[PDB]
Coordinates of C-alpha atoms in Angstrom, one line a residue:
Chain L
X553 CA -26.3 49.0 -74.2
X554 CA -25.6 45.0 -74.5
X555 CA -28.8 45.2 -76.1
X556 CA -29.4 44.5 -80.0
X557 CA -32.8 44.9 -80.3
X558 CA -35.5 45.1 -82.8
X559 CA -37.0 49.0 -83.1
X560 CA -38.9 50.5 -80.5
X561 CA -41.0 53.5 -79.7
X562 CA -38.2 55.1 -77.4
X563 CA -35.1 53.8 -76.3
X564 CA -36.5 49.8 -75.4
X565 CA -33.5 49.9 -72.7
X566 CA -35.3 52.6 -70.8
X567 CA -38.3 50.2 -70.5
X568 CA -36.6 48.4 -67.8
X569 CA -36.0 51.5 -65.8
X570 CA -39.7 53.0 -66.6
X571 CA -40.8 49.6 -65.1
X572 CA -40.6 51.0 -61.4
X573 CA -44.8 51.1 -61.5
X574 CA -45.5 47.7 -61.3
X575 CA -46.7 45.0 -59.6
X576 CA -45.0 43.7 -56.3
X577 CA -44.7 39.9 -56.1
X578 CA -45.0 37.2 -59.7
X579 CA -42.3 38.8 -61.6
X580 CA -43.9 36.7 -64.3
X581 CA -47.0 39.5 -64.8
X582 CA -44.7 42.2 -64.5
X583 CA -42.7 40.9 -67.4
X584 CA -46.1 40.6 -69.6
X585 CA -47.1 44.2 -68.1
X586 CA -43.7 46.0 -69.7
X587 CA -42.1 43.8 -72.5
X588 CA -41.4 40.4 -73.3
X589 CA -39.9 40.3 -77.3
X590 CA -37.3 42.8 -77.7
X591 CA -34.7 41.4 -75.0
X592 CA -33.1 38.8 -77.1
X593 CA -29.6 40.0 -78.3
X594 CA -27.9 37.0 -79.1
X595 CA -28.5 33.6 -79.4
X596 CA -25.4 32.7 -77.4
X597 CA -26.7 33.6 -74.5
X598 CA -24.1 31.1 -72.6
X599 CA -21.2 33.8 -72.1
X600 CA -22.4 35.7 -68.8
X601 CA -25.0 34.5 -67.2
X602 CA -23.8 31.5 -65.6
X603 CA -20.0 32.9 -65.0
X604 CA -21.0 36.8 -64.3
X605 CA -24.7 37.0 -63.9
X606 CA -23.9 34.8 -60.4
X607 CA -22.6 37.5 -58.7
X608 CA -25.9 39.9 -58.6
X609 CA -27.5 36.1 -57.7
X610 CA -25.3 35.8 -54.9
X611 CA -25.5 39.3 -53.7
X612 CA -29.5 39.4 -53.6
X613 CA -29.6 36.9 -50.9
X614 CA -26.4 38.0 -49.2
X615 CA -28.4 41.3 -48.8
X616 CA -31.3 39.9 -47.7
X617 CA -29.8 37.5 -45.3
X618 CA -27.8 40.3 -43.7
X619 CA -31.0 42.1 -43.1
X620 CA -32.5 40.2 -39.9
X621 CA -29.0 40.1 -38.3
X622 CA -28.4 44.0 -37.3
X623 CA -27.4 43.0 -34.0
X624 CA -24.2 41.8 -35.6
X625 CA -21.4 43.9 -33.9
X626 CA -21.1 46.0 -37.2
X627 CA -23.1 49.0 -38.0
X628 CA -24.5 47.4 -41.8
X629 CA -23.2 43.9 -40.9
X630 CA -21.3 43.8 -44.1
X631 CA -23.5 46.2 -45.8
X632 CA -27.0 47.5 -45.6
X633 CA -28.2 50.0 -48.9
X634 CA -31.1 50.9 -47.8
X635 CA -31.3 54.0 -50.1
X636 CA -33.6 52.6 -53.2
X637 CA -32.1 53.6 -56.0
X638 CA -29.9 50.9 -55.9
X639 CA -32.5 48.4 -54.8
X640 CA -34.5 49.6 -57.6
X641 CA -31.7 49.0 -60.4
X642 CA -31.0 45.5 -58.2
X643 CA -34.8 44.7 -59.1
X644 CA -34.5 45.9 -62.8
X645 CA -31.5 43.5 -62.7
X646 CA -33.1 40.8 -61.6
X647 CA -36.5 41.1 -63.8
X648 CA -33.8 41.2 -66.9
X649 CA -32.1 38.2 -65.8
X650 CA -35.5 36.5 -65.4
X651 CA -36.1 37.1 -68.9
X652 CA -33.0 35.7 -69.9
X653 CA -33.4 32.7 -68.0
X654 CA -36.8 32.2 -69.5
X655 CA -35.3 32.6 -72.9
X656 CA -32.4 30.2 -72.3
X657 CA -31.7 27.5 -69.7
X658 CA -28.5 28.7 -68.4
X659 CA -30.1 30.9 -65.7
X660 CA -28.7 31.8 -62.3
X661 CA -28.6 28.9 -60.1
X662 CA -31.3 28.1 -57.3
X663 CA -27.7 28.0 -55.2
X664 CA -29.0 24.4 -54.9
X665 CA -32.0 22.8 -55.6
X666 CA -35.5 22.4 -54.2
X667 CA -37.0 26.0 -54.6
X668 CA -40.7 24.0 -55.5
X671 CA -39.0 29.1 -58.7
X672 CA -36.4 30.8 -56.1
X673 CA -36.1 33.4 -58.6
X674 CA -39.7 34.2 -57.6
X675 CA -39.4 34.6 -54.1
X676 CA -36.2 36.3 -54.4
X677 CA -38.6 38.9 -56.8
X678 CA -41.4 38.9 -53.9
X679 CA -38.4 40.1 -51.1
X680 CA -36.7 42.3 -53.5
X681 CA -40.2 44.2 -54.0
X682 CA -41.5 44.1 -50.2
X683 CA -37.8 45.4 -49.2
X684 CA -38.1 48.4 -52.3
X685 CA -41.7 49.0 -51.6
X686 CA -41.0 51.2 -48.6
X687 CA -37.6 52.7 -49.5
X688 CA -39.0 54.3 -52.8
X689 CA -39.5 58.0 -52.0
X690 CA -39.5 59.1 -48.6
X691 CA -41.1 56.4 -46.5
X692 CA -39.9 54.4 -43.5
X693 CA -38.7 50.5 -43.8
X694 CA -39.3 47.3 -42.0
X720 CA -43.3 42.5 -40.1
X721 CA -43.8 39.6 -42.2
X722 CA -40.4 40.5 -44.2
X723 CA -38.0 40.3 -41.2
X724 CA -40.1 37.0 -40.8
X725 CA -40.2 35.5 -44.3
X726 CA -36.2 36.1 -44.7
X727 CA -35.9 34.3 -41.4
X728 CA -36.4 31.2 -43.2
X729 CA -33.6 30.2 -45.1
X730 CA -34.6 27.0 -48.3
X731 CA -31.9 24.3 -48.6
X732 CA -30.1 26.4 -50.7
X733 CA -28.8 29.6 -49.2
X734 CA -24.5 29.9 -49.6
X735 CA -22.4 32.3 -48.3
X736 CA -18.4 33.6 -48.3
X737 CA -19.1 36.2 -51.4
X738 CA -16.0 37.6 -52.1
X739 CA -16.8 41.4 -51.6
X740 CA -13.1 42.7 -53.0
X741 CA -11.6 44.7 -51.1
X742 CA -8.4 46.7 -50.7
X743 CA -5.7 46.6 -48.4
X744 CA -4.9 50.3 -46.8
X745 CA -1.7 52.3 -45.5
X746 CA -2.0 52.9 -42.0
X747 CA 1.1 54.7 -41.6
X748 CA -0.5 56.8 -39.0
X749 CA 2.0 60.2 -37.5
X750 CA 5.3 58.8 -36.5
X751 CA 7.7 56.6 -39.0
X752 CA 7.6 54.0 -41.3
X753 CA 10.5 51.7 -42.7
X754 CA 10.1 49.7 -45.4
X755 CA 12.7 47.5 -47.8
X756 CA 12.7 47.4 -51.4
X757 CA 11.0 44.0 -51.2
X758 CA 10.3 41.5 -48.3
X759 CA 6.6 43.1 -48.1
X760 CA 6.2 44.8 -44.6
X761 CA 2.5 43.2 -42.6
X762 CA 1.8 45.8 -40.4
X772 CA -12.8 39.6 -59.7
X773 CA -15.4 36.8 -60.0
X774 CA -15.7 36.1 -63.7
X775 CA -13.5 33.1 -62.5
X776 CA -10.4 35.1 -62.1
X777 CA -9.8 33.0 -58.7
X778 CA -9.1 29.3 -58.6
X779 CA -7.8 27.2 -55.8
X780 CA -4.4 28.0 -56.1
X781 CA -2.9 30.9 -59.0
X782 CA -2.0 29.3 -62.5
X783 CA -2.7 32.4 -64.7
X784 CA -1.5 35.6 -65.2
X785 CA -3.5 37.2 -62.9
X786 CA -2.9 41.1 -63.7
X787 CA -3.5 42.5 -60.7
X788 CA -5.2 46.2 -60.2
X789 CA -4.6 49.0 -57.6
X790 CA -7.3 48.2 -55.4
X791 CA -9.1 44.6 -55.2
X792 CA -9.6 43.5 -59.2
X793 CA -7.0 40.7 -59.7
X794 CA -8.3 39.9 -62.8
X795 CA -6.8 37.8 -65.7
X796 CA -4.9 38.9 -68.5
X797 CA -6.7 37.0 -71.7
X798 CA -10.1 35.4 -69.2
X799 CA -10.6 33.1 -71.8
X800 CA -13.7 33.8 -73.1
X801 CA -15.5 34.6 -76.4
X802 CA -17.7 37.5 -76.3
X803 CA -17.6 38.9 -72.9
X804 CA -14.5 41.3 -74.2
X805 CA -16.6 44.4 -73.2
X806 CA -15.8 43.6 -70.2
X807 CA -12.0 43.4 -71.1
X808 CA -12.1 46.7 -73.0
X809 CA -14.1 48.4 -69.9
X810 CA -11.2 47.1 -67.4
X811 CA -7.6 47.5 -69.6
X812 CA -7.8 51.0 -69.6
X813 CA -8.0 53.2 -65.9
X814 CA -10.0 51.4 -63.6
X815 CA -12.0 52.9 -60.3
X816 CA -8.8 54.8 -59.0
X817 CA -7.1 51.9 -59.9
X818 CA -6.1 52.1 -63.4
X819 CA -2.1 51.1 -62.5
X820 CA -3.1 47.3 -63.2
X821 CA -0.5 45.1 -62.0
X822 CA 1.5 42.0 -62.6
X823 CA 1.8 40.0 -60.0
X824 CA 3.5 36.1 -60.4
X825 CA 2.0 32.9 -58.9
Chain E
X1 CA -13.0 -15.3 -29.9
X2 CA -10.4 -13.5 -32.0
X3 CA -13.3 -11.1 -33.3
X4 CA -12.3 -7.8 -31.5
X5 CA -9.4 -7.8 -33.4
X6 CA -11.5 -7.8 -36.7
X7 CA -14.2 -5.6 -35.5
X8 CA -10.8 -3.4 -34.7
X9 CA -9.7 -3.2 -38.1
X10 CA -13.1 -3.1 -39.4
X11 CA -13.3 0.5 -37.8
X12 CA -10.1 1.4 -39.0
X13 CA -10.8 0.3 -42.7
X14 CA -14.2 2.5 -41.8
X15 CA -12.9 5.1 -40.7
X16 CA -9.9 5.1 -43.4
X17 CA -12.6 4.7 -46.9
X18 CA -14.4 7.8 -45.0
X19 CA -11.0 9.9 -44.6
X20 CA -10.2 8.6 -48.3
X21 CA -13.6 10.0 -50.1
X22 CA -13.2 13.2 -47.8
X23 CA -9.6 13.9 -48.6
X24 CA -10.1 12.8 -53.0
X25 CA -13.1 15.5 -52.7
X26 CA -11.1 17.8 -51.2
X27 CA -8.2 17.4 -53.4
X28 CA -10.2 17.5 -56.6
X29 CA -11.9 21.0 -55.4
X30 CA -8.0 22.7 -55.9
X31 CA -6.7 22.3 -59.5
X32 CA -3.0 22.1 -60.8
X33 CA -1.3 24.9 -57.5
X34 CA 2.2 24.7 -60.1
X35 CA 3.4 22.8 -62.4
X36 CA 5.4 25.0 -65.0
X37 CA 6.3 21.9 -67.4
X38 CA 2.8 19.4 -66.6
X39 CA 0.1 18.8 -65.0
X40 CA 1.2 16.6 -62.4
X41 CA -1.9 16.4 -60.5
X42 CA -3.1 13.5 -62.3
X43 CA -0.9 11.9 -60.5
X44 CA -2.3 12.3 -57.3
X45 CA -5.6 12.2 -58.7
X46 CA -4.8 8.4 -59.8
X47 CA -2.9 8.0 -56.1
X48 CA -6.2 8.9 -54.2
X49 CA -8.5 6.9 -56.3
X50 CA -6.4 3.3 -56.0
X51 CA -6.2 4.6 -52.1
X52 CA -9.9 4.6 -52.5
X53 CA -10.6 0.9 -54.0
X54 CA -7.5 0.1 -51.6
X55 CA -9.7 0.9 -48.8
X56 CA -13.1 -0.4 -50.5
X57 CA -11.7 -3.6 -51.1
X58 CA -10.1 -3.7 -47.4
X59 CA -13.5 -3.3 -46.0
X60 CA -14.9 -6.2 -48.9
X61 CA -11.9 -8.4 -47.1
X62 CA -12.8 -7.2 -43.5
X63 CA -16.7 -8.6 -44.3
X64 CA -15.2 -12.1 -45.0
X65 CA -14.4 -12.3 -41.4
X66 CA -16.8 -11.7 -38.5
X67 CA -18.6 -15.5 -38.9
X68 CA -20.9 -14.8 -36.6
X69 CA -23.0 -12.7 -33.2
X70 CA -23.2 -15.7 -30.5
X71 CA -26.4 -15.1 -28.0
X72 CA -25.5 -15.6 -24.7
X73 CA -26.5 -11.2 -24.3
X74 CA -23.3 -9.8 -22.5
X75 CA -22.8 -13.4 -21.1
X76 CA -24.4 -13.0 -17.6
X77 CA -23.6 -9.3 -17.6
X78 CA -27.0 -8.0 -17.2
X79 CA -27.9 -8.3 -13.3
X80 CA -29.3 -5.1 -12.6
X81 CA -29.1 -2.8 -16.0
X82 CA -31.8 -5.2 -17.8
X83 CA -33.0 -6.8 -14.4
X84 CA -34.6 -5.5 -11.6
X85 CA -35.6 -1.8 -11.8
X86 CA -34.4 -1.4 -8.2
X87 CA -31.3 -3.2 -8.8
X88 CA -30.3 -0.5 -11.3
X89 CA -30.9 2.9 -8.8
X97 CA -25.2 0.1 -12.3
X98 CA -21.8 1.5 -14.2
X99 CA -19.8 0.8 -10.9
X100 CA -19.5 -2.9 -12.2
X101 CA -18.7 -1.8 -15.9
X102 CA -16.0 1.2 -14.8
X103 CA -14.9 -1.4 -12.2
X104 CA -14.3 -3.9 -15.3
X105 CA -12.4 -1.1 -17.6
X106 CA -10.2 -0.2 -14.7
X107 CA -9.3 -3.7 -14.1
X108 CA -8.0 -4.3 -17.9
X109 CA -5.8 -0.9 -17.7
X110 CA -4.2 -1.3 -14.1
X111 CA -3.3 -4.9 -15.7
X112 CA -1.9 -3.9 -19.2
X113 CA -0.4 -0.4 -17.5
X114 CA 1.6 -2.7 -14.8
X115 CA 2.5 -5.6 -17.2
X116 CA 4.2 -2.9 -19.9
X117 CA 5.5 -0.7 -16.4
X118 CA 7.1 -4.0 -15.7
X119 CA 8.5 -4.9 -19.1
X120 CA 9.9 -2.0 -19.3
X121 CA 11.5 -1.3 -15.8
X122 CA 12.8 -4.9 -16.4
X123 CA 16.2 -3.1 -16.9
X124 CA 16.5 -1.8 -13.3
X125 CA 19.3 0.4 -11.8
X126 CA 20.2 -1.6 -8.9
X127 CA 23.8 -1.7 -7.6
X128 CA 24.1 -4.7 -5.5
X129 CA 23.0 -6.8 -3.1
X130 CA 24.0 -5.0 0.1
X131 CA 23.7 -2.2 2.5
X152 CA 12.2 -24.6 2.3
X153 CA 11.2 -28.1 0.9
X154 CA 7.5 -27.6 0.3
X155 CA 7.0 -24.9 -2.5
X156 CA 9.0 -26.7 -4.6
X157 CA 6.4 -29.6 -5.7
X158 CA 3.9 -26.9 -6.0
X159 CA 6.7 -24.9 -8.8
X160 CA 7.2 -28.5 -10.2
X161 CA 3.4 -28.9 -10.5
X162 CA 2.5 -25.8 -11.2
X163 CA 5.2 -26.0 -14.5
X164 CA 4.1 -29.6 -15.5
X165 CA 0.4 -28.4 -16.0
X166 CA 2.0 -27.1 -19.3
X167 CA 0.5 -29.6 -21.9
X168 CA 2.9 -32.0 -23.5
X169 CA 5.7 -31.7 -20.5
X170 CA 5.0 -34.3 -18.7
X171 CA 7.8 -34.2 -15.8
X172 CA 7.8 -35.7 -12.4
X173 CA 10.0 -35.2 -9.3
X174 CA 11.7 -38.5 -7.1
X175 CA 14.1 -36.9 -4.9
X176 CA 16.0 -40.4 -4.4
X177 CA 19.5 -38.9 -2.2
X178 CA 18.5 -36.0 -0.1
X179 CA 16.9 -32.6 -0.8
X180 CA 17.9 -33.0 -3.9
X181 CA 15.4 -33.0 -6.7
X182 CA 16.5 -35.0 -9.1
X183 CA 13.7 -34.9 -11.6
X184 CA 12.9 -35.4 -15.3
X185 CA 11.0 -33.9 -18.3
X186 CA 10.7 -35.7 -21.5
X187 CA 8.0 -33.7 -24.3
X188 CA 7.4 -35.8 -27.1
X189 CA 10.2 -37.8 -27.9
X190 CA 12.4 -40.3 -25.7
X191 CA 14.5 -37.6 -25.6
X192 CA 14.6 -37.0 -21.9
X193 CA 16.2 -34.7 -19.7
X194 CA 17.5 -35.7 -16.0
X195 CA 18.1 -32.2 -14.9
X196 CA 19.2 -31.9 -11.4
X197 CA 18.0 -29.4 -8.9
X198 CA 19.0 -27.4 -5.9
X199 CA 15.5 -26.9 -4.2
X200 CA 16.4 -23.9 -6.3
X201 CA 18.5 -22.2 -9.4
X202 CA 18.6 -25.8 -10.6
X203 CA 21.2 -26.4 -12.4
X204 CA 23.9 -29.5 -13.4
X205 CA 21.7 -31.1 -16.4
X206 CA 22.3 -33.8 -18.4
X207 CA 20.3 -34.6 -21.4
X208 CA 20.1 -38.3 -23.5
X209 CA 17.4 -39.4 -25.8
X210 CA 16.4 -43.3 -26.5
X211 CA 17.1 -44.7 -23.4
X216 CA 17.4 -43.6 -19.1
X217 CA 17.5 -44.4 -16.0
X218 CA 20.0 -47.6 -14.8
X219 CA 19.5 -49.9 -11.5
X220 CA 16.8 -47.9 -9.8
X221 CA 17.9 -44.1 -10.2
X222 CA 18.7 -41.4 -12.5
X223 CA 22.9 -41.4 -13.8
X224 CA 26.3 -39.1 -15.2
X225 CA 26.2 -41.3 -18.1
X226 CA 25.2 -38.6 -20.8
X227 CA 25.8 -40.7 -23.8
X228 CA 24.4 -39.4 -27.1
X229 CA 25.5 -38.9 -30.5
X230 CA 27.3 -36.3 -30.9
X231 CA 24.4 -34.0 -30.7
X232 CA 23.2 -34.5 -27.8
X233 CA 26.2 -33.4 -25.7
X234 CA 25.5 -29.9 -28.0
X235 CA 21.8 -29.8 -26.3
X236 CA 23.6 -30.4 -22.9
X237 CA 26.3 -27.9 -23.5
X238 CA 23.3 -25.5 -24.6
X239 CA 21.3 -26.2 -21.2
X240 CA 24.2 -26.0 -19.4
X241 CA 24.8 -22.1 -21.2
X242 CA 21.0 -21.2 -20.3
X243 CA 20.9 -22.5 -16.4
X244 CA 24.1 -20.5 -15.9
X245 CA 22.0 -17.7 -18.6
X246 CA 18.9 -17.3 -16.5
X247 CA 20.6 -16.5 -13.0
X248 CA 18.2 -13.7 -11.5
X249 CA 18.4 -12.4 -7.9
X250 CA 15.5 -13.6 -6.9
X251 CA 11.9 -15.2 -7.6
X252 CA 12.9 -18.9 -9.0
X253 CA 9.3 -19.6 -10.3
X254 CA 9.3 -17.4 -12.8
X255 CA 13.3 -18.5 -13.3
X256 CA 11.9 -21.9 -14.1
X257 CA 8.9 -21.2 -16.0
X258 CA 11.3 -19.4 -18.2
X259 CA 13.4 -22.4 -18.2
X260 CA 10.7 -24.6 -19.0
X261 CA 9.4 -22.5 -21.7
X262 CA 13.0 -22.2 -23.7
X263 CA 13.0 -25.9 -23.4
X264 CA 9.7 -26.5 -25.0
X265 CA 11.2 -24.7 -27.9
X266 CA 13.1 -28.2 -29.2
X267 CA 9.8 -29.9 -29.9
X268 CA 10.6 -29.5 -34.0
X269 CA 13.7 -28.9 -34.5
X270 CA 12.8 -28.4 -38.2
X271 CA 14.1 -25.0 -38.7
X272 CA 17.4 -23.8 -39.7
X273 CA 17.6 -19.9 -40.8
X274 CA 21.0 -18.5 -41.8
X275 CA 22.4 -21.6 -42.9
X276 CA 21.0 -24.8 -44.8
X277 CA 19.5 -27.4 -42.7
X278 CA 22.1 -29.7 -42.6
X279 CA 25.0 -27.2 -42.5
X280 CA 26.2 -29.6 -39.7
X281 CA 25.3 -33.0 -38.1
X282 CA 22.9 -31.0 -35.8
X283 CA 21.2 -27.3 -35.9
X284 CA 19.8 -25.9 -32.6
X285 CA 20.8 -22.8 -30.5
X286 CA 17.5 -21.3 -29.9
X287 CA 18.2 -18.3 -27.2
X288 CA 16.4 -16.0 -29.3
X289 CA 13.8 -18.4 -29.5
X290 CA 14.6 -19.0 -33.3
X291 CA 16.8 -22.4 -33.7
X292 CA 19.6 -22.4 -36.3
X293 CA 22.5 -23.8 -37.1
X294 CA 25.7 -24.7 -34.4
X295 CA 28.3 -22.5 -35.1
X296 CA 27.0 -20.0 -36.3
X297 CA 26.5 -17.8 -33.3

């Protein structure tokens, strides 16, 4: 709904859903086969794609590296969606974000350098992965192969927010009215805390103002009740 | 052949330029932690950058010494590593070498230090003493020599650079009973108590007097007159005075701490 378009037979954001019948690898023709004018909102493009848009760049190739290794001592590793629909919407993602970084220069990073077009090959594992998940097929052959081979650019340590439980399991508990008892990317973490950093209930921790210019969707999305964790919280440095 | 030393802090000023970029770069990956009133991490910033061309211009220093490699390879050390193929099945000789240097340096400091010995008490040969006398006169610029004129006495005589001489009496050992004059001596055909001076000599006799009856050890003389000898060979300048002027008095000299100052002031 970011989108202001130019008019459209039907609903031009439901063109990058409908584009599930295409072509497997060169997101390049697939872009030419569905649409390439109408997905140019604003001219400022520079206000999420090289703070937020790095997160779905990060998390392709954390899922793809985390495939090969399901000998880890963990059932998905750290997690394994192999149910499609969410591979699907991670591929409509990425063929959106490859037009935006063909209409502006501030694309997602190749995580370093040297990719001879990583978003490419990203595409072409994306699409051999979602090929056989799609409606009642069996999965991985070449793939497990071809994401053996890592470029010199692949990081790691994504930070996956999580939430902290209470394990008080059948007996007792006995807390203190402080003295705590041991027992989220747009920025929003530096090295050490010099913000407001209004926590949430579960993982968030997100800044108070993010100091930004256009992303307050965002913002207004996250203020009110959040996923079970609409009691944001202050929390000092 | 002072280079090991060099090479030494080479390494260190190496090793220090490496820690330096490693610890800037990791410092400048953690912004302001808290400040509350400014950003004092400009600061540290600045700190670690002058630590840096600190240690860049220690290494530029380091490169202006090092002259040069000599050839001689590992002077005469290859035998059977770069010699015969039989010869070398060779790291006995090396670990053999290595082993050497530490016993040495681990018993001289073991010695130094257990120099201070917890023992209670004591209770429950005229040929080695040429050999002592020669053996402390290979020392350049003392040239001494013995003449035992009445008895096994040694009545000997050391004069460094000066006609300053000493006739200091022995006991074929702990010698003791010296007398120092300078400019002339030796009268009739023997040494002699005369131990005129000018008022500053008789200080320099009182002084050798104070060491001799200073360096008294239980036993092993040689190294009780190489010690002696060595404190001696301190009065070759006599052109140092700290903690005072250098004419506080007529004379200045009371080196026991090998550093000579002022009379009187001790």
């Amino acid at each position: 709904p970011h989108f202001l378009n130019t008019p459209d037979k039907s609903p031009g954001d439901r063109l990058a859903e409908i584009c599930a019948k295409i072509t497997d690898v060169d997101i390049d023709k697939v872009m030419i086969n569905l649409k390439t004018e109408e997905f140019v909102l604003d001219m400022n493009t520079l206000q999420a794609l090289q703070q937020l848009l790095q997160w779905v760049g990060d998390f392709v190739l954390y899922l793809l590296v985390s495939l090969p290794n399901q000998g880890s001592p963990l059932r998905p590793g750290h997690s394994f969606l192999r149910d499609g629909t969410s591979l699907g919407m991670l591929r409509e993602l990425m063929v959106v974000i490859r037009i935006w970084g063909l209409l502006k220069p501030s694309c997602l990073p190749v995580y370093t350098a040297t990719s001879d077009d990583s978003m490419s090959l990203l595409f072409r594992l994306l699409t051999k992965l979602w090929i056989c998940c799609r409606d009642e097929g069996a999965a991985s052959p070449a793939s497990d192969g071809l994401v053996s081979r890592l470029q010199p650019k692949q990081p790691l340590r994504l930070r996956f927010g999580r939430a902290p439980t209470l394990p008080s399991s059948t007996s007792t508990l006995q807390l203190d009215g402080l003295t705590r008892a041991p027992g989220l990317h747009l920025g929003a973490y530096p090295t050490e805390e010099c913000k407001a950093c209004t926590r949430c209930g579960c993982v968030t921790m997100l800044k108070s103002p993010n100091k930004t210019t256009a992303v307050t969707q965002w913002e207004q999305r996250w203020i009110k009740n959040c996923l079970c964790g609409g009691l944001w919280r202050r929390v000092p440095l | 052949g002072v280079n090991l030393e060099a090479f030494s802090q080479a390494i260190s000023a190496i090793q220090a330029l490496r820690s330096s970029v490693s610890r800037v770069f990791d410092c400048l990956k953690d912004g302001m932690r808290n400040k509350e009133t400014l950003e004092g991490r400009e600061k540290a910033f600045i700190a670690n950058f002058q630590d840096n061309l600190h240690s860049v211009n220690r290494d530029l220093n380091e490169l202006e010494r090092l002259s040069n490699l000599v050839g001689k390879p590992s002077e005469n050390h290859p035998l059977h590593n770069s010699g015969l193929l039989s010869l070398d099945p060779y790291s006995q000789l090396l670990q053999a070498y290595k082993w050497s240097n530490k016993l040495q340096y681990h018993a001289g400091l073991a010695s130094g230090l257990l120099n201070q010995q917890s023992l209670k008490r004591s209770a429950n040969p005229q040929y080695v003493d040429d050999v002592i006398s020669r053996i402390d006169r290979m020392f350049p610029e003392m040239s001494i020599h013995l003449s035992r004129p009445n008895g096994t006495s040694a009545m000997l005589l050391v004069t460094l650079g000066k006609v300053l001489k000493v006739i200091v009496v022995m006991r074929s050992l702990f010698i003791d009973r010296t007398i120092v004059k300078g400019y002339n001596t030796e009268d009739g055909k023997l040494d002699i108590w005369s131990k005129s001076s000018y008022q500053v000599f008789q200080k320099v006799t009182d002084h050798a007097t104070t060491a001799l009856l200073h360096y008294q050890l239980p036993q092993m003389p040689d190294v009780v007159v190489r010690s002696f000898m060595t404190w001696l060979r301190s009065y070759i300048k006599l052109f140092q005075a700290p903690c005072q002027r250098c004419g506080k008095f007529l004379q200045d000299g009371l080196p026991p701490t090998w550093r000579d100052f002022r009379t009187l002031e001790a």
